[PDB]
Each structure stands twice: as structure tokens, then as C-alpha cells.
Amino acid sequence: GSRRYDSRTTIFSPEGRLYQVEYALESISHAGTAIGIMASDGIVLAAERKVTSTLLEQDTSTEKLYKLNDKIAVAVAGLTADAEILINTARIHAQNYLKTYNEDIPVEILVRRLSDIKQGYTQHGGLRPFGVSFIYAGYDDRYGYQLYTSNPSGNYTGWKAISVGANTSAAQTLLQMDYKDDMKVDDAIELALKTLSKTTDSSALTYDRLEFATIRKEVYQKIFKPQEIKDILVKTGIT
Amino acid sequence: YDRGVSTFSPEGRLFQVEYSLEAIKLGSTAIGIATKEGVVLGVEKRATSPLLESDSIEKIVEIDRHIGCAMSGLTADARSMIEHARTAAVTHNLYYDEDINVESLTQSVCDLALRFGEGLMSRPFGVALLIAGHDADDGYQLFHAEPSGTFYRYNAKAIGSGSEGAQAELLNEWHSSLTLKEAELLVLKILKQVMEEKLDENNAQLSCITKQDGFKIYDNEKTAELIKELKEKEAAE
């Protein structure tokens, strides 16, 4: 039968590791760096675009950052098509929760459900895992601003500042070096862009290679237009 | 994984059944002795640490008032088998207003065993059962139920890692005129022999089935009294 061709995803190695999860994580280590920083007054999301050309519409490409609802955004590293599948599921879940309770979904509930979807593919069904890591930025009235990450295993963790993708050891080193709990969103914007600039493997960080977003106080949720990215890059002295 | 779970060896045996039998050789010893007065079951409670509460191990279980089971091997697999057996016994009482025979229950469990494959459970059970009981048709009966889905009635049987030595001693020392007290002490004797630990009321557990009161597991105090009695009488053997 077909047993010959089954690669047997969802098996343990002798070390008790899930090899498809480890290899999907390797895949994500080649994706464009994304950074989340939780300020006192908000959250910054920043991401590097790996695909670049003069002929790309950077003004309409929106491949790294997505709104999940009015209060929650994600940054993506990895396979954008898999991410779009999961993002659509999360959007539906948030609206189902609002329909049921007439309240906006708590950020952790959304993150947990999407992480559980990712876990399922590691345990049953014989399919490959989703090759995406997310950073979730959100606000809710229970914990306020919250920053989460999740990976192909369906593990999720809360962070004050976090990086996913290529340069994350360097990024987390620089974030440990410069992060402070008191820092404002305008401080965190600088820290994010300085970390991307110091971690990018390109020659220089430029507004076409960037996506940027903020969640700040109601809560407003801004994806930066490229001119705003120019403004912020000159304001930070990076361009 | 190369080979499908349902395949025969060239010798005409199912590989996964054979390997399940290899799993049972690793299990802790269970011993059954049938007598005209009752069936005794004893088990080695192979505690892995002193912080383990030996009283939670529960390798002997009631299947019905006059039917008990001792397990050896992958004892987590036994819980499904015992759930099925208990359901069968209760369902039989529901449908016929009478107790299930011990043999019909053993068959019900053995019918479960080869229902594994693909396209059903993924594998055989890794556990052997000694099924002891009483019924009015055939009296005190002991059965060995095996992951092959075969069973035999036994006068006495040992299963698990001690089984070959214990069974050789059962071949020596079983006889039809054994009293239940003699079966109790013979079980304790052979456990003590094949157990690596010193036999005591914490390392081992006993039970019997008698028609007057059914299946009961012996408390540690009674077992310690019997182990003392064995230690006394061993002076003359």
C-alpha cells in the first residue's frame, strides 16, 4: 500500500524530539526577522521584508503584519500561505467569541486556540506542521498590553520584548541590553528599528524593507504607511 | 514499520503477537492456583521506589463478584480489557438475569485481542491475564488469557518474568487435594522464590475467590500472618 511513502510526521525521535517541528523551526530561522516590544503605553511590531526588488509594490504588499481584530495584531515569520490560513482561523474565532459573549476576545484565548491548532498537526493526522511563528500584540482589559509568541510546536509564551526569525539570538541579546520596563512606545520604536538595523543581513535598513505597526491608547491599531516609515527612520537617525 | 502489523512470519506466526509475548516476559509475576475450595491469585507488587505507595499498585482487580483477574506485562493495557470484561459480566446479568460463566468472560476478553490492524486498535495488548472465578456449571476455574486471543484453563499457572521457574514448581507441587490454605502458602512460597525482593506484605498481594464470599483481596495484615506461618513451617520443609 501507501505505507511505503508515508514519512511519518508526528513521531518522536529517540531523543523525544519532533523532527518535523525542529525542521520547521529551521525553516523559520531563514525568514525575515520580526520584533515585538511591549512598552508601558503600547506595543511595537516591526518586521524586515526578505523579498525585495524595485518592481515590488511595497505600498500594497502586507506580508509580515496582519490585524486579527481591532485590538490584536500578529507579525509573521515563515510560510506566509500557512500563516494566512491560521490568521483567517483566528479572525473567525475572535468574531465567534464576540458573537457569543458580546465582548472582545482576550488575547491569550486567541493565542491558545491557534497554538492548539498547530499542536494538533504535531500529534495526529499525518500532515506536516505549519511552518510559521507568530508574534501576537494585543490589548485587553484584564492584562492590558500583552505580547506573545508561538511556534510550530504550539508552544506559546508571554514576553516583554521578543524576536522571531533569522537573527533572534542577536536580537534578543540587543533587546536584553537596551529594554526597560518604563520605556514609552516612542522609545520602543527606536529600539525596534535599531535592533533590526543592527541585525539585518542587508547593507542598510530602508523603508521599503520594513513593515511597522503599533497598538497604543481607546486602543488604536496603526499599520504604518511607507511614508510614515520614512519619517520614523529619519527621526531615529537610521536613514 | 517496514512490515504491516497484520503480517505473518514465514513460520506462520503474527510478528506483533510474538513481540507482545516478549513484552509479557518482562512483566511482574502473577500466580494462580485453583483448588476445589477456591482459587488463589498472588502478584509481585514491583515497587519502583520506596516513595511509591504500594497500596495503589492494584495488579489484582474484581471483574465480578465471583471473577477476579491478575495481570502481568503492560498493565495500562489491562484497564481496557478489564473494562470490557466488567461490562460483559454486567450486560450478561442484565440480558439473562444470571452470572456470566468464567469461560464465556475469558472468551469475551480474548475476542478483543486480535482486533488490531489498519483499515481497531493499532497493536495487540502487551498484557497477559490470569482469570480466576467460580461458576455453578464448572466450579473454581483458572484461565490464562494471552494477547494471541487464545486461552487455556489451568490447574495452576505463573505468568511474567518468574513464570518458568514458578511453573516448574507448580508442576512439582500442585495436586488436586490442596486446601486453600495450602494454595495460599504455595503461592507465597513461589513468589518468595522468584521475587528478587524479600517477600513481605508490601512486596506482594494475595486474593482468593470463594463461592461463599466471592472474590476478595487479602489485607496486608492477613498476608503478613500467612508469611509468618510460611516462615515458621519452612523449618520442616
Binding site: - | 474484581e62 454486567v90 450486560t91 446479568n93 442484565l94
Partner: protein
């Protein structure tokens, strides 16, 4: 038909009639309207006989499986909820049931749950069910006490069934008495309602109209 159960210091009395009818025809005088679910649980058949008998015997099976799994007697609350959930799953399918689940456990003490085809589940001290229930209530509410003797409680049960048998044509035949104790239920025998009627009529002097 008439069935009753009441709590007292001695536990629970269950009293039932044995009449069965088909229109005006008396089909049987000797129906057992108490189902002995197990040595510790009783149920009372007052709906359709088949539904009560079948499902309370199955309830006994579920109690036995629970005891084997959990190594403990099932609660009367648990048994009555198992039954009421089953009956509710067939709501509108046309089950006909009206039963007191009676038992006495250490955690709960003597407990009665009324259970209905409609899915009602009521705990209570006293219940009377069937076409004669109002006559039984009339005696029982007039005469019930918690401190009543066991023999007085059995007599009160018998007299309430007798009152129904006198007035309700569909009740009678004989009285079956049960006494639920912590140690289990005790059957206190069968009492023919005609013998009982003429006895009480002379000894008590009641039914002067007859």
C-alpha cells in the same frame, strides 16, 4: 395505582399497591410495583410498567459498573440523575414513568428522589404517586411524624395505601411494604387489601359509610 415513600428516623418506608387494570378489567392483582434495583436501592413503578422495570434494571447495572470502577456505593443522587438524564433523552418519544428512587447512604442519609418522564428530579421527605396519591397524602399528612416508630411508619404506609384502595378503583389488590435502612432494604411482606380493609374497619372503626 398508588405508590408512596416517606423519610423517618428509621429511614424510608416504601408502600405500594399491586392492582393492574386495562380499562375496567383487572388484569392482575399481584403486580410488583417496587423494583429492587440493588440491595440498597429501590424504585417505584407508577408510570408505564415496562419503562420503569427496564430502565431501573439498567440503572442497577450502571450502579454496579460505578461500584466496580470507584470501589464505593453509588449515591442516590447520582442514580436518580442517571435515570432522569436517560429519561430526558427520550423526552417526547413517549416514555411513561413516575418513580421514587429510595436509598440510604452514609454521606446522604435516607434519601428519596422523585423522577418523572418529563425529566423532573425532586428530592423530598414524602411522595405519593399514582391515581390514589391524593388519598394517600390525606392520611400521611394527617399522621406523619419524623419520630414515628418503624412499626408505626409501616402501619401508616399500609393505611395510606388502604385509603387509596377504598377510594380509587384502579388501586388495590395487595400492599407491599419495604423499609430502607443503611444496611439495605427490608421487605415487610404482602397484605391483601380486602383482609386489611375489613380488619381496619372493625379494629379502627373507620369506613363507617361502607
Amino acid at each position: 395505582t398508588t405508590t408512596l415513600a416517606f423519610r423517618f428516623q428509621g429511614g424510608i418506608i416504601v408502600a405500594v399497591d399491586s392492582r393492574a387494570t386495562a380499562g375496567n378489567w383487572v388484569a392482575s392483582q399481584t403486580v410488583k410495583k417496587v423494583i429492587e434495583i440493588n440491595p440498597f436501592l429501590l424504585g417505584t413503578m407508577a408510570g408505564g410498567a415496562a419503562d420503569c422495570q427496564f430502565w431501573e434494571t439498567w440503572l442497577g447495572s450502571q450502579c454496579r459498573l460505578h461500584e466496580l470502577r470507584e470501589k464505593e456505593r453509588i449515591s442516590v443522587a447520582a442514580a436518580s440523575k442517571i435515570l432522569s438524564n436517560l429519561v430526558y433523552q427520550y423526552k417526547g418519544a413517549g416514555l411513561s414513568m413516575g418513580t421514587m428512587i429510595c436509598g440510604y447512604t452514609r454521606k446522604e442519609g435516607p434519601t428519596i428522589y422523585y423522577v418523572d418522564s418529563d425529566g423532573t428530579r425532586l428530592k423530598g421527605d414524602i411522595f405519593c404517586v399514582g391515581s390514589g396519591q391524593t388519598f394517600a397524602y390525606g392520611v400521611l399528612d394527617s399522621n406523619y411524624k419524623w419520630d414515628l416508630s418503624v412499626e408505626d411508619a409501616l402501619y401508616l404506609g399500609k393505611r395510606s395505601i388502604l385509603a387509596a384502595a377504598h377510594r380509587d378503583a384502579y388501586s388495590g389488590g395487595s400492599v407491599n411494604l419495604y423499609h430502607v435502612t443503611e444496611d439495605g432494604w427490608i421487605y415487610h411482606g404482602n397484605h391483601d387489601v380486602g383482609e386489611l380493609f375489613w380488619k381496619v374497619k372493625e379494629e379502627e372503626g373507620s369506613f363507617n359509610n361502607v
